[PDB]
Design a protein around this nucleic acid. Sequence first.
DNA 1: GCTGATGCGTG
DNA 2: GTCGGAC
DNA 3: GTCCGACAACGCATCAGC
Length: 642
Amino acid sequence: SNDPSGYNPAKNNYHPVEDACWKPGQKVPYLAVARTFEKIEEVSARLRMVETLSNLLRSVVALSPPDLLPVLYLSLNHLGPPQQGLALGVGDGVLLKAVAQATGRQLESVRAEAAEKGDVGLVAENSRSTQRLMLPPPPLTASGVFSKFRDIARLTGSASTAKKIDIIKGLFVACRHSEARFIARSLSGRLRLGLAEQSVLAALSQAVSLTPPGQEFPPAMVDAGKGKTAEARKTWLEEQGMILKQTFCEVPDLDRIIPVLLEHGLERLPEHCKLSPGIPLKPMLAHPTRGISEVLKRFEEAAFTCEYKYDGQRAQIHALEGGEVKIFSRNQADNTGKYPDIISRIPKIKLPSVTSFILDTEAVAWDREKKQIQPFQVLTTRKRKEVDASEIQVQVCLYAFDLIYLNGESLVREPLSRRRQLLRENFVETEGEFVFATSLDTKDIEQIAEFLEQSVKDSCEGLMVKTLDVDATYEIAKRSHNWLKLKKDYLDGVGDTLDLVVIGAYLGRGKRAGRYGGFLLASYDEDSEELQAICKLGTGFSDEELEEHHQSLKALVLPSPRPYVRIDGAVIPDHWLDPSAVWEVKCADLSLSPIYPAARGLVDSDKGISLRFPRFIRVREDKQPEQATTSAQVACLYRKQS
DNA sequence: GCTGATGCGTG
DNA sequence: GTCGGAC
DNA sequence: GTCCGACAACGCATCAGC
Ligand SMILES: *P(=O)(O)OC[C@H]1O[C@@H](n2cnc3c(N)ncnc32)[C@H](O)[C@@H]1O
């Protein structure tokens, strides 16, 4: 209709044709997307964000259906389906260089402003490009921007960075109004709308339900909910939402789903897109549980099983009819080339009656000499891309815990009791290569407590807890965190807790813009009377506690570090702090660090020690830095892990 | 040919 | 990965 | 409970710079 600068997708009674800012068949302008992002970021209520995105999506369906897929990817800040592994190869480094060049400003000035504002988008938006001619280029389109992001991602090899920067600069030259803000945020990986995958799916199912695709233009049906009561409309949209969600969870690939949606409609979608070996599916996740009593409350009177939670990496293993094997990560990345050793062992793990399967396993580093699990850190030293089986140094043992598909049968809707029985009967254990997760079926609190203790003695993180028959399916769309995770470090007063000295602060980004988002912590090295950086810290405080930290630390800001504070390879703090505050910090584990100097030389000649999953517990007002946890005590904690 | 910075990705 | 905020 | 985005350590792969 008129200028996209006035586009209002949050408008009441939004009409997909009359309230759009482009004409039928025209390319969706990128400014329409940016204005939608603005209206989403302005609100706190997720369902209001969904309504606003739905409005844009309904206009796209009604007016410009070829742009639906790029608009969806822009809204997710994705480049394509996850198993294809497209990635920009752009972070703040390349982006800030491009912004500096685009605006003719010094890199260090742009970088400082980005830190201060806590958002690269605001820096890119408020500076004019020294390349822009008098007459600007034509307005950016949603599909055009998306294609340029993909162009950036496809550039590889020597001198590819300069080519990426040229594309980015070209985008900024053509930006108008709020566009540069969101192109910059997209490139930095921090769109930070408050709306992500689940809201995008809800907006999409609502949009195609209210404004059906494939109508002769002008569409006779622009709002198919209008003839329903609010109550009936709600039930209908919820049911349509679940159709899309369950399909996506089984086939998380918009390249596959959107063409079907536009051609056949949402009600027919599950006939055309179904779970199948070779296509990765969304894995079941776990909800953290802070005690066995919380477990029993959550699973009330539902029989459940406890399993060791192995400390490795998830491997979703697919065997297709015909013999091909694929392996995917928890995030649906294709890891087949990383595990030639697993591929060769598949004939050894499955009985010959098994013709196809999808297995849910943990890959764990395994010492064949000592016949014992090795730490996560050892597993991460595996090579990633096209490994050959002869060159493997770190062997892996698979710990299998679920079966999602068998001999052409999807088990998504089957109870774990049956899925587990099919797993145990149709696959073959080999010690140190493929074994079923150690498990316990019980409701006795004391057996569970002992099992949790035993899992930690047996090199695991704690327990997974899973119902066997009540709400015990693998339907991620119904509940994505259907399993519980119980770790010792969740229990109040249990686990590795340290008192550490605050030696630096980092300016916050995004939700933390305008205050500190993170802090640099140190342990006390008695031998050298130095404070040694041990880790950064960025979670565990409430918003109120974070404002209190900002107040209590402001007087401690130094221009230059104290001579007895050693940070070696740590990120230099934005504000150095006079060592004074002592905070209680909890972690899951201690790790040998390539950068942190804490306790260097006490366990390893070259490496100090850091904290895995550190979080703030409380301030120790009754401790001064000389009573903080010592670097010797840190070393003792690390050795005790064995 | 090598190294450190950068990016992606796992947890 | 942990965590807290908004719903 | 769900969803989201602040923030953690640290591995391999890649590429600019040398
Ligand atoms: P997040 O804290 O959601 O943890 C889930 C991951 O735990 C791993 N895992 C190890 N052992 C198990 C068992 N027995 N069952 C399920 N998941 C397990 C997986 O890698 C998960 O992704």
